[PDB]
Point group: C3
Chain length 243, copies 3
């Protein structure tokens, strides 16, 4: 019966917490047939760039190639209740040349250590822009952004939701205030009616205009001021004063 | 040739649909060497909290530790066309103490049963806020929100997209209407020109103001009304009436 | 010692780049005990619909059922540095009937080949709407949309962020301009003050109105124009002209 020389050699227990940036795991074999074995990571799945953040005492499957010193460790997924901080990166390469820092792959990263969840893309295959969808749990924010300045923003400590583009035009909802900003113009359109604000003008073009102030009304011009009516012009007040 | 006592014992077939909240699976061994075996879940991958939603008749790999009664079941991924409703939770623990309801982990959940896709974070390691990015397929919505009231919203039955913060400031795009609301002020800025609306004021500060009405123009003040011009003030109408 | 007839038969090397839409992989066994073997995909994990985009020379585990011609290939995850373009689809079925094009499942897809990252849902189990959260790296955009016209948009080449609903109401932030559009009305609310624009009206209802123009002020009506003040009406200018 032909069987590969590469086989499950012994069930084991991790003797140490795997260091975050390490692929080696010290494992103690616990089957009756120093005492630790330095094992190389054997992934449970493809497209996972980081080994599991194995804690001391987790059940580990130790694989061995024949009688050689090539030992491998595979997480068995039976000791999840031991996990503390976990950071996992799933990578999907996006370059014609192989080899590879996330510069040549699309990825999704859950990092408790660095306190973010991020989906990011790369510019290694003709893509014009890079993107990131990030939940930043450290500062407290959700971002949707490219690499040229366009950004959706939810920032919790400032109670801010914002639509911001690369030209500093934005719609900002921060606390009890809303701020719109645009260097060329801001225009409201409803049917045939328009209201525009631009660096030199405030323009309204509509059918009927009604400006009601329960208190005072003030309109002041540094230059000339014109009132024009195709129909009758009406003034109603207890008295009229011309300075 | 040393080999672990823990080995693939027999290929089998699931005899029942696995109940959603169960880790045990009844499996019938189908290799010639009651008839069902209660098996414990053996995961194919780490960071998966839920066993596959195995349907009756799926090919199952039955593992066994030596001659003991410890039987384990592993989905082989060769019977995907039998799947009906699936709910899968990937968890990434985010607490210094181990052990663990999603209160101590970042996670991503695809649930056909509960009709949502959700990416959520936890507040178990000093994070100031929790977050959720949810596609709610039951009610019909996409949400981006924290746990204090800041929210992006796409709600389909109401044709609503909204930016809403914890102070009830919002930019609402619902059906054929747009509503902006902010308790302190709403300000539009374009260059040196500003338009502000606040609880007691409507203020415009610009260079040139043009208000054209194809129909009627009405401005009414409960108190005083002042017209001021540094240059000539012009009135043009077929007739003028002072009440 | 009972062991399944289905076992790891030999470690091997992929002889060819797996074609994107293929489940078969030509593998050369490299254990001493034509020369290629057509193997069927054996997944490393459940809920993965696409086999890994295996490149020539990757280490492959060849499984075999007994002495039969049923050979299977499993990616070992030890040759990731050979990956070039990768497209991976994780599927989560969402239909009461089994069987299945993404029409009956929720899914998440990372595709370097087609240049997008997409989370999508289906309408096979009573869901009223389908959804997609897509990073389109080809055109350069992030979309959040349903299947009836509601859409959040980040489009990089146009420097556009937009909230757009099925009735063509939108808040558009494009380059140096902001455009709001709504067929019924656009209303700003701050406390008791309101500013509304609708197809026939421009309405302001506030306490105090101040319209300051450093240059000229023009208000023109095709019909009548009325000025009403409950208090004194004041005119201040170097001279007044009635046409
Ligand atoms: Cl290492
Ligand atoms: Cl793994
Ligand atoms: Cl080697
Ligand atoms: Cl990379
Ligand atoms: Cl501001
Ligand atoms: Cl159970
Ligand atoms: Cl599994
Ligand atoms: Cl046990
Ligand atoms: Cl938890
Ligand atoms: Cl409202
Ligand atoms: Cl095929
Ligand atoms: Cl796989
Ligand atoms: Cl078969
Ligand atoms: Cl499908
Ligand atoms: Cl427009
Ligand atoms: Na890690
Ligand atoms: Na301000
Ligand atoms: Na696996
Ligand atoms: Na489930
Ligand atoms: Na309303
Ligand atoms: Na592929
Ligand atoms: Na325009």
């Amino acid at each position: 019966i032909q069987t590969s020389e590469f086989r499950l050699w012994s069930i084991g227990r991790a003797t140490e917490n795997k260091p975050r940036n390490s692929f080696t795991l010290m494992v103690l074999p616990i089957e009756s047939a120093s005492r630790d074995i330095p094992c190389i990571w054997l992934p449970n799945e493809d497209n996972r760039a980081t080994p599991p953040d194995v804690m001391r005492g987790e059940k580990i499957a130790i694989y061995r190639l024949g009688d050689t010193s090539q030992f491998y460790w595979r997480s068995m997924g039976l000791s999840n209740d031991l996990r503390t901080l976990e950071s996992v990166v799933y990578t999907f390469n996006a370059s014609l040349s192989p080899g590879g820092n996330f510069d040549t792959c699309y990825f999704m990263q859950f990092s408790a250590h660095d306190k973010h969840v991020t989906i990011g893309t790369s510019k290694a295959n003709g893509e014009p822009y890079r993107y990131s969808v990030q939940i930043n749990t450290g500062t407290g924010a959700v971002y949707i952004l490219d690499d040229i300045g366009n950004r959706f923003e939810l920032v919790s400590k400032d109670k801010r939701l914002m639509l911001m583009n690369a030209d500093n035009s934005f719609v900002k909802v921060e606390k009890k205030a809303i701020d719109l900003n645009a260097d060329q113009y801001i225009k409201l359109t409803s049917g045939g009616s328009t209201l525009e604000l631009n660096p030199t003008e405030f323009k309204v073009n509509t059918t009927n205009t009604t400006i009601k102030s329960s208190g005072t009304h003030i309109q002041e011009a540094g230059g000339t001021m014109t009132h024009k009516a195709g129909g009758n012009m009406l003034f109603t007040a207890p008295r009229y004063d011309f300075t």
